[PDB]
Amino acid sequence: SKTILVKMMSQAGTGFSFNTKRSRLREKLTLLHYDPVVKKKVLFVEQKKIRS
Amino acid sequence: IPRPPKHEHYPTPSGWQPPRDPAPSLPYFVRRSRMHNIPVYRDITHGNRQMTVIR
Amino acid sequence: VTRVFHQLLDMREPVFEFVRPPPYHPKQKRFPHRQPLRYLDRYRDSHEPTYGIY
Amino acid sequence: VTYFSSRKGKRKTVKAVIYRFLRLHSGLWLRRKAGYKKKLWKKTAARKRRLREFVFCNKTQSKLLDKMTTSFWKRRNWYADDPYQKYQDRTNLKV
Amino acid sequence: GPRALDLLRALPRVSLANLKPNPGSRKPERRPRGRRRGRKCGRGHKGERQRGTRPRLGFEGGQTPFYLRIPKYGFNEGHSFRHQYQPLSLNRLQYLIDLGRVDPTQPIDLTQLVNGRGVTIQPSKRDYGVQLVEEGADTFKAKVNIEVQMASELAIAAIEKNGGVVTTAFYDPRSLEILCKPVPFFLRGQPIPKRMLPPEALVPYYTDAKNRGYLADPARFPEARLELARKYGYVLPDITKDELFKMLSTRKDPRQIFFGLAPGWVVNMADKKILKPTDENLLKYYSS
Amino acid sequence: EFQSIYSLDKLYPESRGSDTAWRLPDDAKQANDIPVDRLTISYCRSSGKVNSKAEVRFHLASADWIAEPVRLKLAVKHKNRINRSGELILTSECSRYQFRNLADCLQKLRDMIAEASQPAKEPSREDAELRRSRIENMNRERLRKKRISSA
RNA sequence: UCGGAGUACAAAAAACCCUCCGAGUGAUUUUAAUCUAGACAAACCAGUCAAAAUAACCAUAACAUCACUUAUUGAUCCAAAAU
Ligand SMILES: [Mg+2]
Ligand SMILES: [Mg+2]
Ligand SMILES: [Mg+2]
Ligand SMILES: [Mg+2]
Ligand SMILES: [Mg+2]
Ligand SMILES: [Mg+2]
Ligand SMILES: [Mg+2]
Ligand SMILES: [Mg+2]
Ligand SMILES: [Mg+2]
């Protein structure tokens, strides 16, 4: 099995990104992270796939 | 360099005080600098040696 | 209580603080090595520029 | 380092230094940490911070960088708006 | 005076034959001769160093050099283009007036500061002029008309309180050069050039009455000037009613370098004459 | 007598005369809050950290430039910093320049008068440091609750 | 190249084409912020801890967890991304 490095984006409309290792054969990742600009715990959805 | 202007009050705002009218009776004399200040300087050497020179 | 000091004891009223000791800093070094820039601010006297002969 | 140039007979500066360091007037040199832009997802928050710092060089390095750099880079600068003007002098140093 | 003189009667002539350099003045050089300084002569033994060939300065012996493993970061980035304002404290200005180097009577601009050697400007280093700092504010008692290229609120206030006038003016590099050292410029045999405007970055600075900008709208001046006095709690004097007021209001044209001269004139210093263009095109150009 | 395309008169046609800038609009601000002549301003110069204490004293009841309702509310909120001789006392510390200190004092005074002259001030209190106060109050009120007359 | 045990018996350090095990990652959700006293370690580069203070959330709510947990990693430049 390989994992993957995906770029994850805030739904807070603030451009903010953080990269995460996620299982290749798994579903598109969605998390609750901390956005520094809005200073809140918000929903992050995976925008892009960076590294393999 | 201009001789300093006479004032009505000493010492001046910047704290500069002219020499006296007569000279004292001491058996030594300390000239003013060409800028009319008292020639006491500080000097360092080797970064740690602090000295004070009277010229 | 304020009334007491003025009215009875014929005094000014003393007020106190709680003062904590100043934070401990190591001896300052000529070449602080691998130390954040803000190092130079710990030994700073007061925050105000001073232009020495200028 | 070129100690005597060909045309001018002066002493050249090594620019590769001027790009990555910053000389305060006191003689302290300042540098970024190494690998601070590299592989960030793999690192701790704490470590990330330790990397984001601006740090000072030890004496040896300072003398080295001085030798690799001409006199111009050691002059007293007054820049408008300068972040670092605060840091150029040294205070309360008992040595 | 010098009792030493009295000894000099007793001693033989001072001549070329007896002259001693001050002891310690010359540390005698040493040569690789003899048992001590010979036989390897301070160079060590074999290796690269005794032969003279050790590598260049930054080289660490092949491990990636210290000065190259650190990443590049703009520090000195675009440094040559940053603007540099030589600071002048109120402390030094006062000290200068007190000893009568600069006189507060006539208007004080850069050239006056330079001529008193209270300050030194080197345009080649991208000095754009003097900036005024507040170091001596509390102690500053003099009354002046001053023109600098930058100033701080506190400095300004400190000058207003004593009934003087501060104005911030801009000079381009060429202008500045001419302004600091006028007499070497007049030996150049060239007309007096126009003063350039500020670039787009510095315009919002010199257009504000906040800064007492030379390009500012004088309608705003008394207002802001009073605002200062509200903030620092002092009664603002009426400059209008003073006897030196004619000197205090004195300006320069935004296009003019000096006081009382004009762009395009030529100073003939051997004859003590000025020469002015009568031509229409020249007068249109210099006066625009 | 030089003039340019860019001169001060042709840039701003409206104002011209050389005395335009130095006019004093005393009619513009007639409010004149804090008539500084009426304050006692003391300077304690502490040099060593180098800081200059600047102090502003004035009699509260005898100060007429503030309205009566405001003059009374001030003596309530700030009674801590009022003096037995009736003096309100402000103090600033920070800068080495006493201009800046005086400015801090005056700004403090302006703000006190501002919030006291606002009837809309609700005096909102935080529960952070006052939780101890409310609870220890309530709990000394459990004991205080004993009812029989005395003296 | 990196780690654990012995060699190296009790602070640290300590070699061998010395004796033995490992690592070049998984799995999971508790998705693990900002800033800063003081230290460990150290030729340098790199590594480590960490109070107070802010902001997040119960409305006085900051150590990701497990696999011996220790190791699961790579400087500058330069390239791609646009934040
Ligand atoms: Mg010396
Ligand atoms: Mg020789
Ligand atoms: Mg020998
Ligand atoms: Mg021999
Ligand atoms: Mg030999
Ligand atoms: Mg050898
Ligand atoms: Mg200079
Ligand atoms: Mg140690
Ligand atoms: Mg904490």
From TrEMBL, chain A:
GO molecular function, one term: structural constituent of ribosome
Compartment annotation: Mitochondrion
Main location: mitochondrion
GO BP term, pick one: translation
Lineage: superkingdom: Eukaryota
CC annotations in GO: mitochondrial large ribosomal subunit; mitochondrion
Keywords of this entry: Mitochondrion, Ribonucleoprotein, Ribosomal protein, Transit peptide
Family assignment from sequence similarity: Belongs to the bacterial ribosomal protein bL33 family.
UniProt-recorded name of the protein: Large ribosomal subunit protein bL33m
Biological source species: Sus scrofa (Pig)
Gene expressing this chain: MRPL33
From TrEMBL, chain B:
Disordered as annotated region, ranges: 1-23
Family to which the UniProt record says this protein belongs: Belongs to the mitochondrion-specific ribosomal protein mL49 family.
Keyword Isomerase part of the UniProt annotation: no
Transmembrane regions: none
Gene Ontology biological process terms from the UniProt entry: translation
Keywords noted in UniProt: Metal-binding, Mitochondrion, Ribonucleoprotein, Ribosomal protein
Primary site of residence: mitochondrion
Gene that this polypeptide is encoded by: MRPL49
A single GO molecular function term of this UniProt record: structural constituent of ribosome
Chain positions recorded as Mg(2+) binding sites: 43
Descriptive protein name: Large ribosomal subunit protein mL49
Subcellular location: Mitochondrion
Native species: Sus scrofa
Source species, domain of life: Eukaryota
GO cellular component, one term: ribonucleoprotein complex
TrEMBL record, chain C:
Compartments (UniProt record): Mitochondrion
Family classification: Belongs to the phosphatidylethanolamine-binding protein family. Mitochondrion-specific ribosomal protein mL38 subfamily.
Domain of life of the native organism: Eukaryota
Species whose genome carries this gene: Sus scrofa
Protein name (database record): Large ribosomal subunit protein mL38
Automatic annotation (TrEMBL), chain F:
Catalytic class of the enzyme: hydrolase
GO BP terms, alphabetized: mitochondrial translational termination; rescue of stalled ribosome
Compositional bias (Basic and acidic residues): 122-141
Reactions the enzyme catalyzes: an N-acyl-L-alpha-aminoacyl-tRNA + H2O = an N-acyl-L-amino acid + a tRNA + H(+)
Endoplasmic reticulum listed as a keyword: no
UniProt protein name: Large ribosomal subunit protein mL62
Cellular localisation: Mitochondrion
Domain annotation Prokaryotic-type class I peptide chain release factors: ranges: 32-151
Source species: Sus scrofa
GO cellular component: a single term: mitochondrial large ribosomal subunit
Segments for region (Disordered): 115-151
Designated gene of the protein: MRPL58
A single GO molecular function term of this UniProt record: peptidyl-tRNA hydrolase activity
Lineage: Eukaryota, Metazoa, Chordata, Craniata, Vertebrata
Function (record text): Essential peptidyl-tRNA hydrolase component of the mitochondrial large ribosomal subunit. Acts as a codon-independent translation release factor that has lost all stop codon specificity and directs the termination of translation in mitochondrion, possibly in case of abortive elongation. May be involved in the hydrolysis of peptidyl-tRNAs that have been prematurely terminated and thus in the recycling of stalled mitochondrial ribosomes.
Keywords from the named record: Hydrolase, Mitochondrion, Protein biosynthesis, Ribonucleoprotein, Ribosomal protein, Transit peptide
Entry's family note: Belongs to the prokaryotic/mitochondrial release factor family. Mitochondrion-specific ribosomal protein mL62 subfamily.
EC number per UniProt: 3.1.1.29
